[PDB]
Amino acid sequence: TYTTRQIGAKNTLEYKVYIEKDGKPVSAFHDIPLYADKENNIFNMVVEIPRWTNAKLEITKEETLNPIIQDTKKGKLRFVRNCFPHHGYIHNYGAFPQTWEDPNVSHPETKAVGDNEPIDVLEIGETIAYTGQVKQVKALGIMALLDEGETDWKVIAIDINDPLAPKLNDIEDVEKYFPGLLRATNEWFRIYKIPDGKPENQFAFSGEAKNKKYALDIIKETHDSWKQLIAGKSSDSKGIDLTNVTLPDTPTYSKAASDAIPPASLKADAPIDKSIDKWFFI
Amino acid sequence: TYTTRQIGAKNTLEYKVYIEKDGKPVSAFHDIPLYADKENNIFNMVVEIPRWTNAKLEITKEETLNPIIQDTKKGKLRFVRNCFPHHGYIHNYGAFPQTWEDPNVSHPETKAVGDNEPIDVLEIGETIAYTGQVKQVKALGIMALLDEGETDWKVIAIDINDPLAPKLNDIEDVEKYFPGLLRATNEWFRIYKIPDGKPENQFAFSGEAKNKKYALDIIKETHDSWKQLIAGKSSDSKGIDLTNVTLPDTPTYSKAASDAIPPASLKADAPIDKSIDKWFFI
Ligand SMILES: [Mn+2]
Ligand SMILES: [Mn+2]
Ligand SMILES: [Mn+2]
Ligand SMILES: [Mn+2]
Ligand SMILES: [Mn+2]
Ligand SMILES: [Mn+2]
Ligand SMILES: [Mn+2]
Ligand SMILES: [Mn+2]
8 A cells, every 4th residue: 555755844845755655665766566457557657746736846866765856946946837828737747657768878769868767647637636646547648748858758647546537548539538638738848848948848740649559668668778777787877766675686675775764744835936826828 | 904804714614704994894895995096097806716716706795794705506615617728717806896787787788687796807917816805906808798698797907016017008918918818718708617507608799808998988887886786776786785884875884794793713724525626628
């Protein structure tokens, strides 16, 4: 059973969320199995950012057991700006554990190196998720995002517990039940960093959303990349903390890393500067 | 100075928000002057619903001093559903005090009776407002929405304190600085009640947003209607509580109404059913 351990108050630099397995903290990056049900294509997704929020929370790569923390820019907490007609993230945003977008090789289909983090997942279900949540989803498609010139695949997924899950099995179903979502998704990842001063991003295949099978192929590739990484065989792991507590055959295995995690110190959400309210029309 | 006195916790049946003048409760409907600056046509807007929220809160016509209260639906609190690509309300939503959409007579431009309540206001500023807030705004334009067959004008306004206030003076400036907003606004009021089983709404003038001058005329008309209502000279006030504490010349004037209001009893917001999370595609 997966639960969460929160340190500090949300919206602060001290905020941390570790994922626990039977009350024992594990690495949110390496210790959670990619597959919930491999042959049925059911995955374990780690939710980082709930739909309609702004705080750029993520599984941090350079901290032991890889707790979810808030990203920063120039020493300041990072909040993704509101871009009309969107409000924060338009999907439950997160990642697939045991995956890695290899930065050391130029990916052929995109002609760019990976963005050095687990593959990204867009969960389109009706219910709003919570940070640290490990839910089971089924992949329906994938879009090749080139984020600031880097391979940044976005998987289109749906919680298996969603009332609409049995009716979704491939990408075309998405447009069927969620008309306009894929187009909005394209636009979002194209312009979300413009209010930051960054250039507009671009998509490969003209932003086309590839089907479920294509999605599985990419997911499995990034899984193998992580297999190489965790095995300690990458040419450059970039200082990523490979500490884990469930993989005894790997060189960075350390059961003790779990007990070293302080106890929960959950505090109420800290306030967010009023400027994040701003809706940008860009 | 205007402040708010909160009763109970937000998102509960006991929730109530009264507006105070120098510490004493006044009628949110009749005691708040319509004009902040009449020479400059700066209006006082009573905010009911903050942008991106779902709780259907509004100035209560049948309660003394007209505290803002959430509408109910079959014994439960009533929320407006999320209609893709929108999240709850897309504007700081409220009304202009001392105005009334006359239900006893048909409005010429729309050929329908008014919806029996203060003229509505959509504040397009960046900062998200709060319930019970009285803010000074400039009128930019107006839209003639027919809500369920009733005259339901929507004034487009901006907080004078908004960074963009100086640059917005007439309707055309809304499209110039908030491109897409007017079209999104048209669509929003047209479909927002569809998930509730209601027919799609319609707009007069093909949804055209009339300019400031036009808007000023309509507002003036609704203000004249409230003067007839507050003076008790309407043919039918529809059981509206006309109790006020600042209009000594009206038959329902009663200063003691202010002292009858219980003291604030603020409590933390109550959780909202997860089903309001749902994003409808209509
Ligand atoms: Mn980044
Ligand atoms: Mn990521
Ligand atoms: Mn990215
Ligand atoms: Mn990424
Ligand atoms: Mn109403
Ligand atoms: Mn109203
Ligand atoms: Mn209405
Ligand atoms: Mn109305």
